[PDB]
Known about the structure:
- This is part of a larger assembly, with one copy of chain A, one copy of chain B and two copies of chain C.
- Helix content of chain B is 66%, strand content 0%.
- Chain B has helices at 4-23, 31-55, 67-72.
- In chain B, helix 1 runs antiparallel to helix 2 (31-55).
- The radius of gyration of chain C is 16 Å and the shape is elongated.
- The chains are: A mainly alpha, B mainly alpha, C alpha+beta.
- Chains in contact: A-B, B-C, B-D, C-D.
- Strand 1 of chain C pairs antiparallel with strand 1 (11-13) of chain D.
- Chain D: It comes from Rattus norvegicus.
Amino acid sequence: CGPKLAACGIVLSAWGVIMLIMLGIFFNVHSAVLIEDVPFTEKDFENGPQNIYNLYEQVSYNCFIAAGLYLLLGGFSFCQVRLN
Amino acid sequence: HSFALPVIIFTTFWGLIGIAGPWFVPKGPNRGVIITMLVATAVCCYLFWLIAILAQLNPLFGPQLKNETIWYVRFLW
Amino acid sequence: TVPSILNRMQTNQTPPTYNKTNKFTHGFQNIVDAYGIGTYREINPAPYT
Amino acid sequence: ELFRSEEMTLAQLFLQSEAAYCCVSELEELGKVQFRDLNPDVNVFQRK
Lengths: 84, 77, 49, 48
C-alpha cells in the first residue's frame, strides 16, 4: 500500500460518499436538475412519469452501491494509514 | 406574507452581529481584530446576500427549458 | 552592579514598522507585507484583509 | 491596537562589558528588539 495511497483512499472515500449520498437524495426526491443525469430514452415519456421514476430508483441504487465501494475503500484506507 | 419580513429578519440578524457582537467583545490586545472581523463579516455577508435576493425580485424574463424538461414538468411536481 | 540603563532618543530617523500577530493574523499580514510595508504608525491593511 | 502600526522608540544604552553578553541573551529570549548597526567597516577581521 504505502501511506500516500492510504491518504488518497481516505480523501477519495470521504468525497465519494458525500457526493453519491447527496445524489441519492436528489434522485429519491425526483429533483428536476438531475433529469440530464437519468439515462432515459424518447419512449420513456409513454403514459406518464412511471419509466423515469423507475430510472430514478436505478440511478439512486447506482450511487448507493458506488458509495458502498467508497466505504470499503475508506475502511481499508483507515487501516493502511496506521499500518504503513 | 410579504418580502419585508425576510428583509427585517436578515437586517436584524447581521445588525446584531455587527453591533451587539462588538459590544460583547472583552478588553485585550486582540479586541480591535475581533471587532473588525465581526463588522467586516456582517457588512460583506449582508451586502452580498441583499444583492442576490434583491436581484431575484420581479424577474424581467423567466427560465427557458429543454423539450424533455418541459415534458417532465407535467408530472414530477 | 551597573544596570546598563537606556535613554529615549531625539535625533530620530523613521523606526522600522511593526505589528504583533498570532496564528490567524500572521498569514493575513504576510499577504500584505509581501507587496509592501507601511510607514511608521500608518493604517494597517491587514485587519480589513 | 492593530488597526495601525505599533508605536516604536529609538533608544541608546551604555552597556557594561561583562553584563553585555547576558543582556543581549535576555533581549534575544525576549525577542522584542532590533539592534542598530554602528559599524559600516564590519568584516571578518574588523568584527570586535
